Amino acid sequence: APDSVDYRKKGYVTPVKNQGQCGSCWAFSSVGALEGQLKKKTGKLLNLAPQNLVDCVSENDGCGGGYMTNAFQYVQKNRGIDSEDAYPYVGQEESCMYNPTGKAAKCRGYREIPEGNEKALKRAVARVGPVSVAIDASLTSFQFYSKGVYYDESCNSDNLNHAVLAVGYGIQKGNKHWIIKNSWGENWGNKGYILMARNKNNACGIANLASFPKM
Numbered sequence: 001a002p003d004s005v006d007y008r009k010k011g012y013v014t015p016v017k018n019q020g021q022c023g024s025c026w027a028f029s030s031v032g033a034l035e036g037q038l039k040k041k042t043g044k045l046l047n048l049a050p051q052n053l054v055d056c057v058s059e060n061d062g063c064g065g066g067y068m069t070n071a072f073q074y075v076q077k078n079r080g081i082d083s084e085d086a087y088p089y090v091g092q093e094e095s096c097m098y099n100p101t102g103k104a105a106k107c108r109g110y111r112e113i114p115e116g117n118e119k120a121l122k123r124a125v126a127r128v129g130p131v132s133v134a135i136d137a138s139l140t141s142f143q144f145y146s147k148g149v150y151y152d153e154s155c156n157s158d159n160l161n162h163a164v165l166a167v168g169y170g171i172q173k174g175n176k177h178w179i180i181k182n183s184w185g186e187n188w189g190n191k192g193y194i195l196m197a198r199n200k201n202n203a204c205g206i207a208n209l210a211s212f213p214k215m
């Protein structure tokens, strides 16, 4: 692997979105990983529809939370996900309005990174593209993150409560990090991004629930 990778610079990452009040982070995370694979396989970068996932992934819980794996499985079994333009995000759950004419990406299932294995996660990010990850984002320090490599001693690697997107990794002043796209708008964090400690004993559970769609 290279010592640093940043998909944002490669045109694999769409702009930062805002989930509003809805606990749909799993849907934004899933969509970001799908968007990365769509770019890698077809050369097109387009916004895909997290609202399609919130409304239609029937065993996830809409604005109450969900697994990215179930979202990828839905897209696979449904043979498609809509573009954002065809199924816009409204920040509340609605009945499923999936429309095949708005289909913008497909998926052949997904792969999970071995639990807790940050080296495998690094490999996946390097070889595959942006990877969906779940972290503990419940702390005050996370809400108020501004700059630097995020590290809070109280982060709980079993309290996976927020899904985000690993779009790269690198090192800042000697501190290894993951480059994480969040979905809380540009006014949170560093224009919507956070650098999270890497190789620091799986800080915040970064590598506990990582997955990527196959395309």
Ligand SMILES: Cc1c(S(=O)(=O)O)oc2c1C(=O)C(=O)c1c-2ccc2c1CCCC2(C)C
Binding pocket: 018, 019, 020, 021, 089, 090, 091, 184, 185, 187
């Ligand atoms: C600034 C700002 C902040 S924030 O800076 O206060 O976090 O949150 C939002 C904004 C917007 O400009 C915005 O358009 C928006 C936001 C939050 C949810 C939404 C939208 C537009 C579509 C409907 C939904 C519900 C998806």
Ligand SMILES: Cc1c(S(=O)(=O)O)oc2c1C(=O)C(=O)c1c-2ccc2c1CCCC2(C)C
Binding pocket: 077, 078, 079, 080
């Ligand atoms: C190819 C292809 C395309 S498409 O992208 O070429 O239009 O759409 C579908 C396929 C399938 O192979 C397929 O099995 C399928 C599709 C669409 C909906 C469904 C199924 C199988 C279960 C029932 C449901 C309604 C979930």
Ligand SMILES: Cc1c(S(=O)(=O)O)oc2c1C(=O)C(=O)c1c-2ccc2c1CCCC2(C)C
Binding pocket: 076, 077, 107, 108, 109
């Ligand atoms: C959708 C879909 C796609 S695909 O559309 O992503 O290509 O591939 C498969 C599915 C299934 O739903 C499925 O059950 C399945 C698939 C492929 C192999 C198999 C199975 C179940 C039994 C036998 C084995 C294990 C060989």
Ligand SMILES: Cc1c(S(=O)(=O)O)oc2c1C(=O)C(=O)c1c-2ccc2c1CCCC2(C)C
Binding pocket: 179, 190, 191, 192, 193, 194, 195
């Ligand atoms: C977040 C974040 C991170 S990082 O800390 O997450 O890696 O790096 C950047 C951002 C930005 O939001 C951003 O606008 C930016 C960044 C880096 C270089 C640039 C720009 C905007 C103008 C062009 C140049 C090349 C000067």
